[PDB]
CSV table of C-alpha atoms and ligand atoms in Angstrom, one decimal:
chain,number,residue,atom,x,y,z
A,1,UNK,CA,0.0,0.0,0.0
A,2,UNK,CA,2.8,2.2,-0.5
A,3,UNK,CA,3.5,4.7,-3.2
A,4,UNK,CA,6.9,4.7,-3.3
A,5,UNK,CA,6.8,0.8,-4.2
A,6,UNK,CA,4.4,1.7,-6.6
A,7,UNK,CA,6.2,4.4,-8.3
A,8,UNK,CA,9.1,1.6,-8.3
A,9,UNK,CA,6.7,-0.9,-10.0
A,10,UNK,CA,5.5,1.4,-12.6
A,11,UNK,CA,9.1,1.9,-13.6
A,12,UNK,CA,9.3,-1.6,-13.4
A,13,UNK,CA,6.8,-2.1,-16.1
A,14,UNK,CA,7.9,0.1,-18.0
A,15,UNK,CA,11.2,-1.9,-18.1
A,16,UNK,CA,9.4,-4.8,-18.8
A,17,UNK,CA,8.1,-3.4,-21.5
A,18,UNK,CA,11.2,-2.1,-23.4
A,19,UNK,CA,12.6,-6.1,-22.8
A,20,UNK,CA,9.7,-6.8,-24.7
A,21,UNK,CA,8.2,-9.4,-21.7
A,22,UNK,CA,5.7,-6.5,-21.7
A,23,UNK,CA,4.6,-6.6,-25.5
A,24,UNK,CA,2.7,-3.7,-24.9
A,25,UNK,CA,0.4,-2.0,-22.1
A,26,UNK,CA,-2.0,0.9,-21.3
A,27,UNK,CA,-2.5,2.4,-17.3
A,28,UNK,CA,-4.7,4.3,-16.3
A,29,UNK,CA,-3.6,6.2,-13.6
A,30,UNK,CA,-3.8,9.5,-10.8
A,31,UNK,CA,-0.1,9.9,-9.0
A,32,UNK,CA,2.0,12.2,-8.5
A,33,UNK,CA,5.9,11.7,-9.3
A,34,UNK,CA,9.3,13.4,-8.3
A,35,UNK,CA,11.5,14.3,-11.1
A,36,UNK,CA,13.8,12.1,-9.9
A,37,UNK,CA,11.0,9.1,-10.4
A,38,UNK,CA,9.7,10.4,-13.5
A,39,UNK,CA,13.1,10.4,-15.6
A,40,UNK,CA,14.1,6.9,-13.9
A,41,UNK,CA,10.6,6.0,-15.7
A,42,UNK,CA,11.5,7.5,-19.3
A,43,UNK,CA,15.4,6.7,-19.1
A,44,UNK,CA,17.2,7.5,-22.2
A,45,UNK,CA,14.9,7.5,-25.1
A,46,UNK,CA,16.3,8.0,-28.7
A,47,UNK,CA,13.4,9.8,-30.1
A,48,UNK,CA,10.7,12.4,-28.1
A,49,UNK,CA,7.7,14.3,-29.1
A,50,UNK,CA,5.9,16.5,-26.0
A,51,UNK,CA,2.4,17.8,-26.8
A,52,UNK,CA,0.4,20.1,-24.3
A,53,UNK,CA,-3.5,20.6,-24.7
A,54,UNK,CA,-5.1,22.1,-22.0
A,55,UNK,CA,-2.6,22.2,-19.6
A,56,UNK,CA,-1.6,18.5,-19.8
A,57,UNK,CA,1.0,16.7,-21.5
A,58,UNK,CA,1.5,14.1,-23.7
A,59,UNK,CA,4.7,12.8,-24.5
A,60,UNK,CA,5.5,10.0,-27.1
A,61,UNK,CA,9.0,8.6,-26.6
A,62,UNK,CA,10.7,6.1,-29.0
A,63,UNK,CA,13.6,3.2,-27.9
A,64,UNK,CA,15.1,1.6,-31.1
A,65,UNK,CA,14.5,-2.2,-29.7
A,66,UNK,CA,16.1,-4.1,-32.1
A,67,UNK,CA,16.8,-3.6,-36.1
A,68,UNK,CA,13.2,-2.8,-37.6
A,69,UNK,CA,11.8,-2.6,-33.6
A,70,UNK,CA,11.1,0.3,-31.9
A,71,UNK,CA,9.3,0.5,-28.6
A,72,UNK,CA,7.3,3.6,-28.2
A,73,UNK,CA,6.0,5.1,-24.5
A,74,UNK,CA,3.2,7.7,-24.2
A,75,UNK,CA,3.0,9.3,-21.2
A,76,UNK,CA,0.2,11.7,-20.3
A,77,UNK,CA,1.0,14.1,-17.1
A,78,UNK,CA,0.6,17.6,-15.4
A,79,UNK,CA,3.4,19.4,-14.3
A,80,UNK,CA,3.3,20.2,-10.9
A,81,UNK,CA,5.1,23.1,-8.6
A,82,UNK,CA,8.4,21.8,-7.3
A,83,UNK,CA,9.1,19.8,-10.5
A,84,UNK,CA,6.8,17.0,-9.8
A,85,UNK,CA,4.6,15.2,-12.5
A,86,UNK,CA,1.3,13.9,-11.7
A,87,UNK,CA,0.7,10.5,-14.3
A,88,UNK,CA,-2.5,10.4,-15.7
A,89,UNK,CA,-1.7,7.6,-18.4
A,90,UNK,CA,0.9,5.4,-19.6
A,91,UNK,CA,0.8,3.5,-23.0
A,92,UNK,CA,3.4,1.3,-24.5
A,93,UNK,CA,3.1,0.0,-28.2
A,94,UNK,CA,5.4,-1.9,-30.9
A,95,UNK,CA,6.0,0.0,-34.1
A,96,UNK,CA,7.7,-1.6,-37.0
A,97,UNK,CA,10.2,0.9,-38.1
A,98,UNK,CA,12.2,1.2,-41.5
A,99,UNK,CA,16.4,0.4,-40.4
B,1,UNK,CA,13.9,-13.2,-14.2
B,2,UNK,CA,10.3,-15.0,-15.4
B,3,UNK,CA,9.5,-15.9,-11.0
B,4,UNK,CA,9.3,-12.1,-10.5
B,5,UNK,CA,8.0,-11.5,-14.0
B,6,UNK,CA,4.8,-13.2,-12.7
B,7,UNK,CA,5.2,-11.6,-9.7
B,8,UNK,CA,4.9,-8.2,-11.6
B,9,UNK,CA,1.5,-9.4,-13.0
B,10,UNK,CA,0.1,-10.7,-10.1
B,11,UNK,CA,0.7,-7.4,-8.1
B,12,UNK,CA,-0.5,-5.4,-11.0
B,13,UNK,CA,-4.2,-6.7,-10.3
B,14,UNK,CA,-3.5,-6.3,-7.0
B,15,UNK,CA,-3.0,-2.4,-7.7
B,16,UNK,CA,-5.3,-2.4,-9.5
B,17,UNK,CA,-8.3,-4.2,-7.7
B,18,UNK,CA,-7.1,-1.5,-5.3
B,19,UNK,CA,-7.9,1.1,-8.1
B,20,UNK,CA,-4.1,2.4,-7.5
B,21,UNK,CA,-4.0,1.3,-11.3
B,22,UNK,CA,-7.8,2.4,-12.8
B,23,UNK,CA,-7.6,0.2,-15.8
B,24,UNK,CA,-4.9,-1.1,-17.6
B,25,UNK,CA,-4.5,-3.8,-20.4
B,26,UNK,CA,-1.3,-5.9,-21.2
B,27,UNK,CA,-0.4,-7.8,-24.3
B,28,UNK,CA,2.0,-11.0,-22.9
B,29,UNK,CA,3.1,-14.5,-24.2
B,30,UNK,CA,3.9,-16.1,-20.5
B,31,UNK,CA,3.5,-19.1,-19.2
B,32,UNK,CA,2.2,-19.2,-15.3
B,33,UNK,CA,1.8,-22.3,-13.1
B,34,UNK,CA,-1.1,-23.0,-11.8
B,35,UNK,CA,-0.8,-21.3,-8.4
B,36,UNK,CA,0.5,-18.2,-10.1
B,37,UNK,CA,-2.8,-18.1,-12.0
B,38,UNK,CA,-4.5,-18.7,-8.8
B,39,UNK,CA,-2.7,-15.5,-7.3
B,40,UNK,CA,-3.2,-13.4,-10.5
B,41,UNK,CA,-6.6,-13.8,-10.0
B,42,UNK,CA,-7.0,-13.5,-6.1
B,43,UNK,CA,-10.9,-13.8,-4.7
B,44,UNK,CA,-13.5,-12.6,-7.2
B,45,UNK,CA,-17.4,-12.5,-6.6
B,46,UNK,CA,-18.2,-14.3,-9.8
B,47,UNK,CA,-16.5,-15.3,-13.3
B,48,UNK,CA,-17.3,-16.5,-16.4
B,49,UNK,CA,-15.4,-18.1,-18.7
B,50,UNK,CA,-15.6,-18.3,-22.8
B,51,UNK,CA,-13.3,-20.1,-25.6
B,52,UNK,CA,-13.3,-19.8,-29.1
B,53,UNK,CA,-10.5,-21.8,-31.5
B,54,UNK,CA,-8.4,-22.9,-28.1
B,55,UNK,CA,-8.6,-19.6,-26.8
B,56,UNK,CA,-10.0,-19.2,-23.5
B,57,UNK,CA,-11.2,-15.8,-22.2
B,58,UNK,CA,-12.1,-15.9,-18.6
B,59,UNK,CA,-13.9,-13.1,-16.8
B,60,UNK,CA,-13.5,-12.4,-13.5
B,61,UNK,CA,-15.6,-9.6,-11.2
B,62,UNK,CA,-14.7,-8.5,-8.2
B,63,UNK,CA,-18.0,-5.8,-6.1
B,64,UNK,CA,-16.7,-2.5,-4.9
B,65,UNK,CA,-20.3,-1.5,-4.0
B,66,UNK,CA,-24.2,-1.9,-4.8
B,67,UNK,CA,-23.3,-0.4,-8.7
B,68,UNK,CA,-19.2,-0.2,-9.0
B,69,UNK,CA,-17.0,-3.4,-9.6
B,70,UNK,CA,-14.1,-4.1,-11.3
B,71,UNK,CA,-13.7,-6.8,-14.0
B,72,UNK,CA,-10.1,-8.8,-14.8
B,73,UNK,CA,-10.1,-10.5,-18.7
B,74,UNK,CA,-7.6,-13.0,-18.7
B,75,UNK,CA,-7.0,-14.5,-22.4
B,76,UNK,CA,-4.9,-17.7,-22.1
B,77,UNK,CA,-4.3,-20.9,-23.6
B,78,UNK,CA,-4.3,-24.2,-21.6
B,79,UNK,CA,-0.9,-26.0,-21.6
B,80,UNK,CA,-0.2,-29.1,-20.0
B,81,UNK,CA,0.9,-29.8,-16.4
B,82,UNK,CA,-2.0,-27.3,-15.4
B,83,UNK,CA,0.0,-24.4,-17.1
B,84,UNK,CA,-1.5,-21.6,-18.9
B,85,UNK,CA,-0.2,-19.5,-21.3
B,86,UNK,CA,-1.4,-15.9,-20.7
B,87,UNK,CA,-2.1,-13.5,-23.9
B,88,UNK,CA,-3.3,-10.9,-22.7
B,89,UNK,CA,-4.5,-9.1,-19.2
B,90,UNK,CA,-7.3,-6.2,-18.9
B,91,UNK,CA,-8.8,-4.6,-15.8
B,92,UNK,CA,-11.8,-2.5,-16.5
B,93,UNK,CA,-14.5,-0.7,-14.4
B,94,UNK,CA,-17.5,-1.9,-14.7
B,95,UNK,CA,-21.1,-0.4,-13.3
B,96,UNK,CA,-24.5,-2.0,-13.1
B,97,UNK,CA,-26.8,1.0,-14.4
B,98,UNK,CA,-26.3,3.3,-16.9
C,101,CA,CA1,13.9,2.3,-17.2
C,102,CA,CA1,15.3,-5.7,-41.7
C,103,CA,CA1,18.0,4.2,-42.3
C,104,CA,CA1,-24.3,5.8,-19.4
């Protein structure tokens, strides 16, 4: 019942995912992360787009997997005072990308 | 490892039944034991279970109140030694009226 654990899992996941044990995911989801927590969740992606409509974000970020694999992450958040990020949505998906 | 892969899942309806997670769906090719899919599933009020072409769907609900409750899909295929291959995982919310 702790939301530092669950921070820790949703990271998790998200590692799972780019692995490809995950093949792909949607959350739906209300918490609020430190910045520290919310770039340990993105990590190093090789591509990003950030979209804002109506004060939230969407961001689409893209991991080349493997040669014509790419894993792409949506994340849907509000930016908070004090450089926190409340997660409203995460969404991973396979895309089949030209090498 | 594939021990606290299942793990993962299995805590992910937890969270979820919780409504930590809301809803959530996950595509998966994994194979659990039977007392992981047991775990995954935890205690619901009632389920129902489908299968079409050796595809099992089962659907599990789980009350929150008199109109609220939370459904789990699990899409799996039956392997032997009582192991199940899981295909897919969705939690949704679910309400009696309209
Ligand atoms: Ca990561
Ligand atoms: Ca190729
Ligand atoms: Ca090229
Ligand atoms: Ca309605």
């Amino acid at each position: 019942g702790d939301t530092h654990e669950f921070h820790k899992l949703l990271i998790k996941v998200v590692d799972l995912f780019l692995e490809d044990r995950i093949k792909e995911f949607e959350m739906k989801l209300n918490t609020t992360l430190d910045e520290l927590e919310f770039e340990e969740l993105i990590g190093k992606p090789d591509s990003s787009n950030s979209a804002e409509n109506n004060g939230i974000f969407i961001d689409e970020y893209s991991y080349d997997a493997s040669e014509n694999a790419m894993k792409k992450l949506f994340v849907e958040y509000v930016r908070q005072p004090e450089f926190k990020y409340t997660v409203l949505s995460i969404k991973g998906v396979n895309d089949w990308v030209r090498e």
